[PDB]
Amino acid sequence: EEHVIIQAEFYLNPDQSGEFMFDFDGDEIFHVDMAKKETVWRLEEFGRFASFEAQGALANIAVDKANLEIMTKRSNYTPITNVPPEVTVLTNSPVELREPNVLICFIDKFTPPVVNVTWLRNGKPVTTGVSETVFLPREDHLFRKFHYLPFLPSTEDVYDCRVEHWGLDEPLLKHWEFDA
Amino acid sequence: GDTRPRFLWQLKFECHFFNGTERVRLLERCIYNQEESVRFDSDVGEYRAVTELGRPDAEYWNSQKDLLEQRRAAVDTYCRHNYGVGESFTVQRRVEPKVTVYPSKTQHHNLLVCSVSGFYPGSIEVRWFRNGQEEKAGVVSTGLIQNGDWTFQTLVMLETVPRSGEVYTCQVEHPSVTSPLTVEWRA
Amino acid sequence: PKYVKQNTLKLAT
Amino acid sequence: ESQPDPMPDDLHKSSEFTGTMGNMKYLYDDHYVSATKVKSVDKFLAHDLIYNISDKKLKNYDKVKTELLNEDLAKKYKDEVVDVYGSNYYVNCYFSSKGGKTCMYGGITKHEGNHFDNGNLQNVLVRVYENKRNTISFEVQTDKKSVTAQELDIKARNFLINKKNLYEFNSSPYETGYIKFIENNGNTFWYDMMPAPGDKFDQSKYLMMYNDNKTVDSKSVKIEVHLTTKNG
């Protein structure tokens, strides 16, 4: 093989949430804001080379919901079995004191696609500069997701990626501190 | 708290491309919770139930020729079309890896670390050499890491018993570069 | 260049 | 603080709109969804509510979905008895539900004690300004003490369509136009009455502004419609 373009979408009850997105060899090309009804590209540049009638995705999402009701009903309302996320925290590039870097919280292999993620600096939550991606498909039909935190490497600092998910008995905290 | 059961529905249209846009296979799959119920493999030509739960749909949709006709042609109208739509910033996108070599903060023996980061495409090749000749044994990698931002990275260590004058080279070959990127470590 | 989607089919009822 | 009045550059010019103006007129010319004493019966996406309201007129729908700026706003009215008023669309109107279906935004108000004991309506002043000079003034009526800006907007425009040809099949007499609301607390805000530039008019995107479900006090609110002809 060489390349794969996936049009992955989903509807989920009872959260009444949905997703519609395209994917190139594991990376998100774009996804549609279910609310604002507009294509948002993973990278700014893409929006300058191609387009997508975002409005049309919602039509698929209506059909998706209906189908969900149908499957839910014929499966004798068999609910999804929660599968907890494997969490890992890495840097974008090899860390070096005061040399700007980014914290990547790799939340993977989980489902349903609903999760609460929080970044922590010395026991306290960080908001400034944080960015996250939508849910990404996996061959095993579970999901992957990434959260990001830009930071200035130090020795004193201790970070955490706090992940909440029904499949976890308790909030998972992933410890990360400068060890180089 | 929130303990209500969840019910999911996923739909994936998979366009697989072999040798550019030469041969193409479209895999349409329906998934109930974490189970694929129905699917359409362009190589098969019609819907096939993956579980009894999906039997009704495979039979139903297959009874609609207009539909089946549209699906069969999707390898062209859909797959090939979309491939070309973004071939410039996806298939052709290239970002050179940032390569650096340094001893690990672990390890007698010295554990060398070859850090290759921020590269795209994901396909890459990194091998160690000792005085101009490959290092089959001793190597240990972290694996290809998909940073999620269209950027990859990977660590590839080498276990060595350093002797003055030895030159341990980390060679990297990647689509972004014609001739390989090399980084030596003088012992 | 405009990206094209596949339409979701309704399930057997 | 209130929203800053527009500058000419901030306004859409009907001259830069090549599409069909009738697609704008369509949304305000004797066109609206109205219901009294009702409660959402379902939802599609987290941020919306579906109500069982029929098209008494031409029997064109019996399910109405309205989208709100966020989920909290939806949680607020999800179980309340309410009144519904707003401008609906069909092009690109989607939702499963569980007859015809139509869409809209905001237009939601609590029903309890928000009316007048006698089928009595409230009058709201609307003064029109063509090229900065007040040409004509009038009133729109609402049966609500607290009413959505939207409701009054629809009513204001509906009137101006008949009496001043606000909008016509293709294009409009006026170049730009915006409706401004002035609340009894010195707070103001306005809507661009003209379609964005280009050859197409996205009714869903246009009506989305009624997202905030913005309400005002009908007995004190003041409305100003500011229009301008291409030259003078």
Side-chain angles (χ1 to χ4, degrees), chain A, chain B, chain C, chain D residues 2-232:
Chain A
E1 192 172 75
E2 269 191 45
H3 300 303
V4 196
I5 280 58
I6 313 301
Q7 184 192 320
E9 39 174 295
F10 73 66
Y11 187 76
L12 172 70
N13 263 322
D15 306 66
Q16 272 147 200
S17 65
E19 187 174 297
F20 182 102
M21 65 110 255
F22 272 69
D23 153 299
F24 182 76
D25 295 335
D27 287 298
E28 170 183 4
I29 294 177
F30 74 81
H31 78 257
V32 171
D33 183 306
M34 289 301 99
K36 299 184 184 181
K37 303 177 178 181
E38 54 190 58
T39 295
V40 347
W41 308 83
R42 186 55 178 76
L43 299 188
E44 281 24 293
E45 11 182 315
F46 303 158
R48 286 187 279 102
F49 305 135
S51 62
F52 177 77
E53 189 185 304
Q55 194 73 63
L58 282 302
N60 268 29
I61 295 304
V63 173
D64 294 308
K65 174 169 191 178
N67 287 356
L68 173 71
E69 311 284 32
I70 287 178
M71 286 306 284
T72 299
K73 182 177 180 184
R74 62 196 194 207
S75 77
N76 268 23
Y77 310 78
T78 300
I80 182 82
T81 290
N82 297 308
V83 169
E86 256 177 49
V87 173
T88 300
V89 176
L90 289 186
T91 52
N92 200 69
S93 59
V95 67
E96 323 186 321
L97 283 169
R98 292 190 199 172
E99 293 292 68
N101 212 316
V102 180
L103 282 179
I104 307 166
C105 185
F106 181 77
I107 302 80
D108 195 40
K109 294 192 180 71
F110 64 87
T111 194
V114 174
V115 60
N116 177 62
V117 183
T118 310
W119 282 111
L120 293 178
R121 166 170 294 134
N122 311 307
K124 281 148 288 181
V126 188
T127 305
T128 45
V130 304
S131 55
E132 73 191 64
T133 79
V134 300
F135 300 101
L136 308 187
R138 277 174 57 79
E139 290 89 350
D140 57 34
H141 308 146
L142 295 177
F143 305 83
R144 323 157 67 194
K145 188 147 137 63
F146 306 80
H147 270 71
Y148 303 104
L149 175 47
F151 77 123
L152 205 59
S154 78
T155 55
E156 312 157 352
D157 291 313
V158 292
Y159 298 86
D160 276 311
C161 181
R162 192 173 177 291
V163 179
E164 297 192 306
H165 183 272
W166 296 312
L168 296 175
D169 291 327
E170 277 152 355
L172 177 44
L173 280 68
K174 244 55 167 59
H175 204 296
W176 184 92
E177 60 180 8
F178 185 52
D179 285 311
Chain B
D2 205 333
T3 63
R4 310 122 91 196
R6 308 289 132 151
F7 304 92
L8 190 55
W9 171 257
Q10 277 182 282
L11 180 58
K12 304 188 183 182
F13 295 91
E14 298 185 6
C15 286
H16 293 279
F17 304 96
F18 311 77
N19 184 304
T21 174
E22 199 167 70
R23 188 220 161 191
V24 174
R25 181 193 172 202
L26 173 57
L27 194 53
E28 189 177 324
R29 17 215 300 213
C30 297
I31 302 157
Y32 177 34
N33 282 312
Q34 196 183 329
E35 264 174 51
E36 179 182 331
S37 57
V38 205
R39 82 156 61 169
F40 169 106
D41 191 319
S42 65
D43 281 2
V44 169
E46 51 161 46
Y47 288 106
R48 287 301 166 67
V50 177
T51 67
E52 286 315 295
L53 255 183
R55 217 180 203 176
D57 315 302
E59 307 195 323
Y60 170 44
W61 298 323
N62 278 337
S63 84
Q64 301 173 63
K65 265 51 188 178
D66 295 307
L67 155 65
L68 240 46
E69 196 186 41
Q70 187 285 310
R71 246 56 177 180
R72 285 150 182 169
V75 284
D76 291 337
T77 62
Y78 179 80
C79 292
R80 295 178 203 281
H81 176 64
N82 287 328
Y83 180 94
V85 165
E87 168 164 35
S88 60
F89 50 89
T90 67
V91 172
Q92 277 137 60
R93 151 178 275 244
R94 267 153 192 47
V95 177
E96 198 184 323
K98 181 166 290 58
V99 191
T100 182
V101 166
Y102 60 94
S104 78
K105 310 100 291 186
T106 308
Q107 278 93 56
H108 192 270
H109 291 60
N110 196 204
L111 217 195
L112 288 175
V113 174
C114 189
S115 173
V116 184
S117 65
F119 60 102
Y120 193 93
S123 54
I124 191 166
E125 173 169 53
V126 311
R127 316 190 227 59
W128 275 109
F129 298 76
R130 185 185 131 301
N131 300 292
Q133 53 200 301
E134 182 103 58
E135 268 297 78
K136 301 293 177 58
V139 304
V140 171
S141 185
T142 186
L144 192 68
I145 297 179
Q146 179 138 40
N147 296 297
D149 63 342
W150 289 79
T151 221
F152 297 62
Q153 62 166 289
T154 181
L155 291 183
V156 176
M157 289 73 269
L158 174 59
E159 179 59 301
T160 66
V161 192
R163 290 175 54 277
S164 171
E166 292 189 304
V167 189
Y168 294 102
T169 305
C170 174
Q171 167 171 281
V172 174
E173 310 205 65
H174 177 289
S176 58
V177 297
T178 61
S179 55
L181 293 170
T182 48
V183 177
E184 310 171 308
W185 168 272
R186 311 313 186 75
Chain C
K2 197 159 203 185
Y3 269 109
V4 178
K5 81 169 189 293
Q6 270 300 85
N7 294 316
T8 29
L9 298 155
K10 288 120 174 302
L11 293 188
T13 307
Chain D
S2 53
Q3 173 179 55
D5 288 6
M7 291 292 279
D9 304 64
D10 303 350
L11 294 171
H12 293 169
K13 281 80 67 182
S14 93
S15 83
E16 310 185 329
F17 171 58
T18 317
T20 291
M21 191 62 90
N23 286 306
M24 172 63 101
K25 183 185 172 182
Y26 171 71
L27 305 173
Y28 295 99
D29 182 339
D30 181 42
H31 175 77
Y32 61 82
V33 166
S34 189
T36 309
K37 284 189 68 178
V38 301
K39 181 200 291 62
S40 73
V41 299
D42 185 12
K43 301 188 49 173
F44 176 40
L45 277 165
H47 69 265
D48 66 59
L49 303 189
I50 289 77
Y51 295 71
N52 284 301
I53 301 166
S54 283
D55 189 9
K56 356 286 182 183
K57 293 178 179 175
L58 302 304
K59 305 278 68 180
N60 282 178
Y61 66 82
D62 68 7
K63 289 288 184 183
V64 178
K65 177 198 64 170
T66 179
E67 279 174 292
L68 304 169
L69 186 54
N70 55 59
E71 211 195 319
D72 294 314
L73 192 58
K75 294 187 179 187
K76 169 189 269 194
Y77 301 99
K78 177 181 182 302
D79 290 303
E80 289 209 289
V81 169
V82 303
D83 293 303
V84 174
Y85 201 90
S87 191
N88 57 121
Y89 64 109
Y90 301 80
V91 180
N92 274 159
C93 171
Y94 310 117
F95 72 80
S96 169
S97 193
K98 277 171 188 166
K101 63 180 181 177
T102 192
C103 297
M104 66 172 279
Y105 300 86
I108 305 301
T109 58
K110 178 183 172 183
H111 183 302
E112 206 63 346
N114 186 44
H115 294 254
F116 308 96
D117 42 46
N118 234 182
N120 265 62
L121 311 180
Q122 166 68 193
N123 284 297
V124 185
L125 168 77
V126 175
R127 280 180 301 167
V128 189
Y129 299 75
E130 297 180 61
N131 292 310
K132 296 187 171 181
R133 304 193 64 65
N134 174 36
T135 58
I136 83 289
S137 304
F138 59 108
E139 303 179 299
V140 291
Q141 328 184 84
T142 187
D143 65 336
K144 310 182 181 61
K145 296 175 188 166
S146 188
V147 57
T148 60
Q150 172 164 4
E151 178 171 340
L152 300 164
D153 193 3
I154 278 76
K155 292 181 169 162
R157 304 208 208 178
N158 175 63
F159 182 81
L160 300 179
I161 288 177
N162 301 312
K163 309 300 156 48
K164 286 290 181 185
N165 292 325
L166 182 56
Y167 307 119
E168 296 176 303
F169 180 67
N170 46 304
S171 200
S172 150
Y174 314 92
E175 174 76 325
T176 66
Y178 68 78
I179 177 172
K180 172 180 180 176
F181 286 81
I182 297 81
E183 291 188 280
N184 65 328
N185 41 55
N187 172 60
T188 63
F189 60 108
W190 55 281
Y191 300 146
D192 190 319
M193 298 171 82
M194 292 296 150
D199 50 34
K200 299 158 193 174
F201 175 60
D202 198 327
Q203 300 176 315
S204 175
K205 264 161 54 55
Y206 181 75
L207 287 183
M208 190 172 276
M209 69 183 176
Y210 291 135
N211 231 185
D212 51 33
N213 199 57
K214 223 298 173 184
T215 62
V216 298
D217 167 60
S218 65
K219 58 176 170 56
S220 71
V221 77
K222 291 279 172 291
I223 300 181
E224 282 170 41
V225 165
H226 292 61
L227 309 171
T228 75
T229 52
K230 201 180 190 309
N231 32 65

